[PDB]
Every structure is written in structure tokens, then in C-alpha cells.
Design an enzyme around this catalytic site. Sequence first.
Site, PDB file in Angstrom:
ATOM      1  N   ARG B 342      38.453  30.143  18.814  1.00 23.06           N
ATOM      2  CA  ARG B 342      37.926  29.102  17.938  1.00 23.06           C
ATOM      3  C   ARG B 342      38.794  27.852  17.978  1.00 23.06           C
ATOM      4  NH1 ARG B 342      35.956  32.418  12.703  1.00 23.06           N
ATOM      5  NH2 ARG B 342      35.391  34.387  13.722  1.00 23.06           N
TER       6      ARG B 342
HETATM    7  N1  LIG Z   1      25.604  27.646  16.494  1.00 25.39           N
HETATM    8  C1  LIG Z   1      26.619  28.063  17.286  1.00 25.39           C
HETATM    9  N2  LIG Z   1      26.789  27.565  18.530  1.00 25.39           N
HETATM   10  C2  LIG Z   1      27.793  27.975  19.324  1.00 25.39           C
HETATM   11  N3  LIG Z   1      28.703  28.897  18.964  1.00 25.39           N
HETATM   12  C3  LIG Z   1      28.651  29.479  17.744  1.00 25.39           C
HETATM   13  C4  LIG Z   1      27.581  29.082  16.818  1.00 25.39           C
HETATM   14  N4  LIG Z   1      27.756  29.798  15.695  1.00 25.39           N
HETATM   15  C5  LIG Z   1      28.843  30.583  15.885  1.00 25.39           C
HETATM   16  N5  LIG Z   1      29.379  30.394  17.104  1.00 25.39           N
HETATM   17  C6  LIG Z   1      30.574  31.096  17.628  1.00 25.39           C
HETATM   18  O1  LIG Z   1      30.834  32.207  16.775  1.00 25.39           O
HETATM   19  C7  LIG Z   1      32.031  32.025  16.022  1.00 25.39           C
HETATM   20  C8  LIG Z   1      31.659  31.922  14.552  1.00 25.39           C
HETATM   21  O2  LIG Z   1      32.693  32.428  13.721  1.00 25.39           O
HETATM   22  P1  LIG Z   1      32.592  32.175  12.140  1.00 25.39           P
HETATM   23  O3  LIG Z   1      31.459  31.207  11.912  1.00 25.39           O
HETATM   24  O4  LIG Z   1      33.968  31.839  11.624  1.00 25.39           O
HETATM   25  O5  LIG Z   1      32.137  33.622  11.609  1.00 25.39           O
HETATM   26  P2  LIG Z   1      32.390  34.070  10.088  1.00 25.39           P
HETATM   27  O6  LIG Z   1      32.208  32.796   9.302  1.00 25.39           O
HETATM   28  O7  LIG Z   1      31.320  35.104   9.850  1.00 25.39           O
HETATM   29  O8  LIG Z   1      33.796  34.614  10.093  1.00 25.39           O
HETATM   30  C9  LIG Z   1      32.691  30.743  16.493  1.00 25.39           C
HETATM   31  O9  LIG Z   1      33.960  31.034  17.078  1.00 25.39           O
HETATM   32  C10 LIG Z   1      31.766  30.160  17.538  1.00 25.39           C
HETATM   33  O10 LIG Z   1      32.439  30.114  18.798  1.00 25.39           O
END
Ligand SMILES: Nc1ncnc2c1ncn2[C@@H]1O[C@H](COP(=O)(O)OP(=O)(O)O)[C@@H](O)[C@H]1O
Lengths: 471, 478, 126, 56
Positions: B342
Amino acid sequence: MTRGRVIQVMGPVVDVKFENGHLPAIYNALKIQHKARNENEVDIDLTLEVALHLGDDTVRTIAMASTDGLIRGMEVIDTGAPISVPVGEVTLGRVFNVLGEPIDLEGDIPADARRDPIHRPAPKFEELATEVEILETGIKVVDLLAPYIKGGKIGLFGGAGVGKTVLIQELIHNIAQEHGGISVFAGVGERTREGNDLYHEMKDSGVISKTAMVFGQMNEPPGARMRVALTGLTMAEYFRDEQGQDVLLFIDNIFRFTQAGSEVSALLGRMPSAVGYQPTLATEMGQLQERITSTAKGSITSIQAIYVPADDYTDPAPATTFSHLDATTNLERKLAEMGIYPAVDPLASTSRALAPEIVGEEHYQVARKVQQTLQRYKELQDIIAILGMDELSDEDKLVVHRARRIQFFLSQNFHVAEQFTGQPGSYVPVKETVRGFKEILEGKYDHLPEDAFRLVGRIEEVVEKAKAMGV
Amino acid sequence: QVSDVGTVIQVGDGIARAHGLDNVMSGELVEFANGVMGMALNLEENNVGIVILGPYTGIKEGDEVRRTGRIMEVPVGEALIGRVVNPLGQPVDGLGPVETTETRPIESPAPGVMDRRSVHEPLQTGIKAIDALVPIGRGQRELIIGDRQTGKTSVAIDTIINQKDQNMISIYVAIGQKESTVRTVVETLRKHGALDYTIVVTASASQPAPLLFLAPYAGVAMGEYFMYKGKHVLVVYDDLSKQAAAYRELSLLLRRPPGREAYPGDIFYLHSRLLERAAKLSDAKGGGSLTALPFVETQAGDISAYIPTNVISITDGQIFLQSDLFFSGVRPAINAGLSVSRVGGAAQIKAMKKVAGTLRLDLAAYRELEAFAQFGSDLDKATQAKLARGARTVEVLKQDLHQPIPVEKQVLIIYALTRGFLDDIPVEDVRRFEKEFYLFLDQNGQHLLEHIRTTKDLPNEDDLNKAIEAFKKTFVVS
Amino acid sequence: KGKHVLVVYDDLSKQAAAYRELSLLLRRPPGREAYPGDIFYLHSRLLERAAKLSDAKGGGSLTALPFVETQAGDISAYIPTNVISITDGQIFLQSDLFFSGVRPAINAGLSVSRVGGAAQIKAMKK
Amino acid sequence: LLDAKASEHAARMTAMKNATDNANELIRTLTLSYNRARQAAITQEITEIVAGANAL
Ligand SMILES: Nc1ncnc2c1ncn2[C@@H]1O[C@H](COP(=O)(O)OP(=O)(O)O)[C@@H](O)[C@H]1O
Ligand SMILES: Nc1ncnc2c1ncn2[C@@H]1O[C@H](COP(=O)(O)OP(=O)(O)OP(=O)(O)O)[C@@H](O)[C@H]1O
Ligand SMILES: [Mg+2]
Ligand SMILES: [Mg+2]
């Protein structure tokens, strides 16, 4: 005289004994302020909240910070009132902790400012408003299958690393920047890094002038994580009631409140529930949730992200919170692994706004047809997995053909996601989404490859991508 | 006297209960007559619950317990570099005492919201796959997750070794590992000269549960001493699953009600409190940083288990090592589909961004296609631009253990792969091509390496293409 | 008084959860799934008060429609099993039927009425 | 016609072999799911029994 003594210290739970006839009420705040008398002691500045009356003039409390350094026999002072936090215009543009103390280094708050207790009964039956209006978000799947309700309660469900934070950031980007009201963010039980990024994003965008933020992240003891949502809710309630203004309320992970309650429950002496949770899970969650409502004097629309432990949707905490929501969005790890973002489950997600008299007849028919085709495709999964596509009939083959396109077209490129992929992202109006799905259902684009529908936005961009691919 | 002296009432399974100790404070260190240390956990009305940090066989009911007046602490300082110590800071390698001067508490608050800064500095692990697909920045928390014997320890050892020429201090924490493996790890670190900047904290499987529970906190407390002085620290937790199991054992010995998989309710708080202390400090606080690489062991590759999902929701990304790829000779066996960073991307240098941008999706597409391509007809584009390119990419990303690569050489080889210069090279000798290209660059391509090192940007494409073609002319296919 | 009454209980599962909460707070020992031992008696004595009285008693009647919410369609759980064994029949609603286009999503194969037939007019019977 | 019949028989044989392999893989995954469910059930039962015992 409101002086007590510390009797027991067991992690976040502290027992205090008072003189007869002067016991503090439940939810009252107690202060411990101790100066080290010698080199074998440390200074202490700690706040406690009354939880139970154990009898024999003994009170069991929950600590708002770390209890290290506490010594049996320390003096405790009763403040006579619950935790009170400042409210008003002074809170706009500031960052607060659970106790209402600013943490943004912009200066202290005057002691004469108005402060309100964080515990109060829920609004009554006659005070509620039940009007339903559509809140456009610019996301295809949300606007099509489970429209959000203005002034309603919206919940986002998902496992670990599925995309709840990205989705809520996209909602903030699309909605909050042009809301016109007040925005409140409560980052209960999440990463401190995310809070730092969000604050700088608000400062750069200028939205922080109308936003109040109270964090209480996951590094805090369970006592703090149990009450920060109440502080944010009190700040939102002030604007809802005393000024009659429209309020946006974002809660980063409401599951952490229940988790902290479960952590505290065992030391309080309660017997464990089914999966080790507290017996009072439903009562506590209801007491928190019922205060977040729209009334005749003002409207509060709230977006809450809800964590699902071990991807088990039958877990008691996710299961009990379903009845409090008007619209839900269910994220699935399988769709994320397939590369489909925002990975919203098209069948598990529901909304009360999907009615013919609210969204129109054409929208309702298109959504129902899409859901029917997806259900049929889900039914054909075992046959496809074992015997392949060869044994299906002509009708089923067309169903699969269109279902693949429909599933891929529900994905979208987000503005926030540009940092990951470098693609600018798009905003899609509701009518464009309805027209695109209607055209797909009619077989107008059956000749295009299914890969042209991924992360595309509008329907014309599908044709553009297919043409660029050499079709 | 009685306010500072206690008497033991009960002893069992590493848990003791004492009478007296009126002035003891919560979390204080206590000492038994046997010399074994203990931690005051519960302050009840008439007795104190003590967790024994050592062998409890020498403690009997009626023994004397005395206060120390200090909250849980470990020694810190530069004199601890190059030594192997237990979680209490006592030397274990047998090279004599440690002459430290300062101490830090085991439990400390994490840096606040306003005390942090966005991560913007790369952490060069020396592994092509990680540095290309899953970049790691200074101050990031990156999870390494995989099944048993998938190369998790080797990645950490190579990362620690690669920090020789960089201003980085490394701390290796081994929880629940075999003593022989730790001994061999220390030996190879000494062989590669990593002990000049490495601290090793060990709590083997034979140690009692409280030491395993306390070891990561001791490691992070040692790291914070350099972190708050303006330096950069790398901390590796060799297994958080062992710590979770030890804490579950400790909680169930205290008769606390368990949750799912018999874990206690605060099992999430246990890891969150530890992992929130790694951060990138702002300029107002010296600009120091601390990087954490926690390890999690899965069962049969199940990423949906309780502990893996708990850890994933804390860190800033995960690196997934797959067992079948490891068995098929693909080492390191990084699953590009499930691995993500991330915070990364902003940490990479400009040169690596240009050439490695599409590599993740290209590798994922090849990996999903190669299983489907086992049957049916195939179009020419799939055969050439996809299957052959993916085979070359897989061959390039392979690496031998304990041989880190400088970032500029990785950038150059990835540029050569991406621009099609490897399309006519047979798959069977791509590794030999890579090693001979590395040898060639040290003599004729020195200016390109120096330009990349100084400017952190890709040089002009004309000269780079000329050099690549010149090497390609003298290479023999065989 | 001789009238006819219809009573609808929207959630018996939430009542069971509240009863479990108040029983655990009173330190009564838990059973399976932490429910108290007498959870069946609660619902049995609640639902046995609905009946049709004889002519001597006045001829009045009371009809009850208890509701039970299942988790992922698991009708083999504790509370659904307890409630099913008490009533005179079940009406099953399934999400796969709901999304397939048939609404109300009543599964005719699984649904059953134990007093069926006698509760119909002749035209409906035919 | 003879060539077509031979090819048809070969194609049916290959399709059935592939279907059998797919079924075997599905069984392989279902076994792991079953083992996880079994462990979870045993843990829940023993925890409930011990909690009931401790309640007295
Ligand atoms: N719309 C999207 N487009 C591209 N990548 C995404 C998208 N949504 C999530 N991701 C990927 O998935 C991960 C999402 O993690 P996160 O949103 O922090 O999950 P949570 O909030 O459930 O812990 C990110 O590292 C991102 O790389
Ligand atoms: N890149 C590599 N090339 C060759 N061998 C390798 C490589 N990486 C690891 N190995 C070997 O694989 C074996 C297991 O690796 P390693 O011990 O690092 O894995 P692990 O997951 O930490 O194992 P464990 O569960 O036993 O602690 C060792 O024999 C090691 O030498
Ligand atoms: Mg998140
Ligand atoms: Mg290992």
C-alpha cells in the site's frame, strides 16, 4: 468530599472504594492525579469511567489510558458528571482525542466553552423523520443495485484488506467536497498512518474548514476505543439539534467498539457469551446506534465501515449490526482476487431505496433483470466447473455470455485508486449507468471482448477500449 | 519492610501469587530470592499476581519476593550492537557483560497523528522480486506470510545482509525458533559481516511462555532508542504466530474465557500495540524511522484464518510465499497476485518506476494464462508476447540465497527484459545471461551505473541500448 | 370476549438473545451456544396461548405468526429447531428464489401446513 | 464417416477424463474445508462444556 481509594488494579479495570453515602453514579468520570513521592513511584494523570456498583461502597471502573504505575491506596476524585467534550464552532477544523482534548498543536480550548456529556438517551419515536431520498455517489454498482439514502444509515461490510478504506475515501472525495453542511470523522480503532494522511488530505483540499475529527486509533487501550465514537456522535448531535444543519458522519470501523467492549467484559465479571463476546453486545450496540438518526430538527447521514472477522458473516458482531442499517454494501474476497473492484457483492447488497416509486420503473426493471441474470449464472457454476460450457443449452450459453459482461462492467476506476494504477478514474451519473446496463442486457455489445469491460467507467469507454485493443 | 517484601502463596505453570507488597505498582518488576525476575500483573485486594520471567522450578511457596521500584525495562545503547541477548537484555553468547547506560520501558505510547510523516525513502532489500513488484519504504510495516519452509527466514537474512553500505540498524527477533537455527543464522551473519550493525534477540521454544510473549516488545524497545535519535532501524519478528500461541497459553493458565480458536479477546490488541510503534517521524522529531517485517505462518495456505486476518488488517501490505512454487524450484516463491504494498510506489526510485510499472500485471496475466494454455488452440500474440515474455520474466526474477543485488543492476536487467532484448535469448540460459551481463557492466558500463547511483534516474536510452547490444553481440547462446 | 385476534411477533430470535443476556447477567449456567437451559420452555409457553376456543368458552380465537431469522439459510440451528417443533407449520423464504424473479419467495416444497385443507373453502379445495 | 466416428469416441473419452480430474480437484479442496470445520466444531463444543462447568 468526593474522595476514594484504589482497591484493585486488573488491566484496564480499576476498583475504587468510596466513603459511605457518597458513591458516584454510573458513567461518572473520576480523575486520578498523583505526584511521585520518591524514586520508586511515577506521576499519574488518568481518567476513569464508572461501570458497576459492586456493593460495600465499592465501584468498578474502566480506565481511559494505561494503568501502569497505579498503586493501591491512591486518591481518586469524583467529578460528578460524565465525560464532557466541547461543542460548537470551536470544534470545526480541530482534531480531538476521546477526552475532547485537542491534539493538532493549534492551541488549547478555553475552559469556559460549552461542554456536553457523551451519554444521553436516544431520540423518541415521535421525533423521527422517515422521508427517503436518493444520494448519488457516482459509483455504478452502488447507484444501480443498492442506492444510498440521504439522511439514512449506510454500512460497508468486508474482511481484511478487501477495500473498505478505499471505498470510504472515494465516498468522501465524491460527496463531502460539495455537501454544504458539516462533516464529522471518527477514526475508531484503525491505523494511525491513515489518520495522518486523511488530515493532510483535508488540509490540502480545504474541506477541513467544515470538518471535525476525533480519532482514538488502535494503539489506545480498550477503554478509549469504547468511547471515542460517542464523542464524535455528541459533536454531530450538537450540529443536528442546536443548529438544524445537515451533517455527514463517517465512522472508520464500528466493529472495534464491540471488540473493545468484549475485551473489557471479561474483567468486569460477566460470564462469556456464545463466541466469547459480552452478554450485553446487542444492548450496547443498540444504545450506540439509535442515537445516530435523522429527526425533525435536522438530518444526519452516516457511513460506517464494519469489519468481518475471518470473513465469517455469521459472526455475532456483523450479524447483529445488520438490523440497524438502511443500505448495506457487502465486499467479498473472491471478487477482489478476481481483480474486480470495488468487489461489491451484487446479490448480498441491499437497500430500502430500490423501489419503483423511488428510483423509477426503468431503473427498477434493469436492476431486477441484472440480478436475475447474475443469479442464474451463480446457479450454473457447478455444471460449468465440472462439465464445462459444452453441455449447456443455447439459452444458458447466452446467459453466461451476458453475465460475464455484466459482472465485469460493475467494476470501476476510482480517483483514489490512481495512486496504485496511474489511471485517472471516472464519475458516472445514474442515468448513464442505467442506459449502459440496459444496452448490455439487450445484446448490443455481445461482439466485444469481455476484457474491454474492466475498470472502464461509461459505456462509450468500453467501445473505445475495444477499438484500442484491435477489435 | 512488608510494603517492599512479599511471600509466595501459590506456584504453578509459570504463574505465582504473593502476599504483601503493599506499595508495588502495576507493571513493576519484582525479584524472587532465587534471582529469577517477575512482573506484577494483577493487584488484588489481598494478593498480587506475578508472571514469572524464567525457570519457575526453583520457586516454592513461602519464598521471599522483593520490589525493584522499576516498571518493565530493558537496557539500550550502542554497546548492545553485535550481541545476542534474551528478552530481558541479559547476554547469551557468552562474550561477557553488556556495558549499557540507559533503559527504556517495555510498554510505551506510539507516536501520535501529528508526529508522523508520509513514507518517501526506499528500503533496498536486494531481492529483485521484492524491489520490483512489492517495494518497501522506511517506516512501513510489511507482513511476510507463508506456509512452513517457504523461505521466509532467507528473505529476512538477505534483507539484513544488504544493509551493509546503508545507514540502517538491524534487529532480528526470533520467537519460538529452534536454537540450532538461530546459531546458524548468527554464524552466517558473522560470515557476511552483518554483526557490525545487528542486534539479535532470541527466545527459543524451550523457554517459558512469558519470555516468548515479551520478546517482540523488547526488540521494539531496543529499536526505539535509535529511532528517536534520528536514525533508521529495521526490526524483524521471525514468528508472530509463536507469540500468539504463547499469549493464548498464558491467558488460559489465568482462566480467562477464550474466543474463536481458543484465542483471547485482546489477541488483536496484542499485535496492534506492538506494530503501531513503527513509524516515520516528522522533521520536528528528528526524522527517524523504524521498519517492521512481522512473520506469520499459515496452515495449508489458508489466508482466511484468524491470526493472518488480524495481522493483515494492521500492516501496510503483505508478501505471500506460495508452497507449490517453492517446490517447483521458483525461489523466492512470491505470489504476485496476492502480494501488495500500500505504501510502496512512492518509495521506489525514479529509475525503478519507469521499468517496473507494468511488471506486476504482466506477471499475473502470464500466471493465469499459463494454466489455461494447457489445452486448445493459441493465437500468435498469446504464444509470443505473453507466454514467452512471462517465461523470461519468471527466469529473471529467480535468485540465489545470500546474494543480494545492487539496485542499479536490477534496474538495468529489468530494462533489458522489458524492452525485448531477451526475446531471442533461449529460456534455458537467461540466468547465465544475467550473470555475464553483471560481469560485463562492471568493466564497460561503469558510467551508466554511476549515473543511476548519483541521479536515481534512468540514463539516456541511446547509450543504454548501445551497451546492451554490445554485450549481446559477444554473448554465446550455447 | 368472543373476538378473533391476529398476533405477529417480528423477531423471536431477538427475544431469545435478550433472555440469554438477562440470564447470563443473573449468573445462571449456560447451555449450548450460551443459551439458558429453559429456552425451549419460554417459546413453548408463549405460543401455546394461541388457540380456538370451544362454543362453551365463547368461540373466540387467536392466531400467531412468529418470525425466525436464519443465518446463511441454516435451518438446523438451535432456535430455528426449537421453534419449528412447536408451530403447526413453516413458510420458508429463500434468497435464491427471491433473486430468480419469484416474489414472494415461498418454497412450496418445504413449506407445510399441518391443518391444511380444513382451513380452506370448498372452491379453493377443488 | 469412419474417421468422424473414431474422432467422436476419442473426444468423448478425453472429455470424461477431464471431468474426472476436475471432480478430484474439487474433492481435494472440500477435504480441507471439512477439516477446518471439524476443528472449529470441536473447539466450540469443548469451550461451551468448560464454560458450563465453570459457571457452577
Ligand atoms: N478500487 C480499487 N482499485 C485498485 N485497488 C484497490 C481498490 N480497492 C482496494 N484496492 C487494493 O486493496 C487494498 C485495500 O486495502 P484496505 O482498503 O485498507 O482494506 P481494509 O480497509 O478492509 O483494511 C489496497 O492496498 C489496494 O491496493
Ligand atoms: N532463494 C533460495 N534458493 C535456494 N534455496 C533457498 C532459497 N530460499 C530458501 N532456500 C532454502 O529453503 C529452505 C527453507 O527456507 P527457510 O528456512 O528460509 O524457510 P522458512 O519458511 O523460514 O522455514 P521454517 O518454517 O523451517 O523456519 C532452506 O534449506 C533454505 O536454504
Ligand atoms: Mg481499512
Ligand atoms: Mg524460518
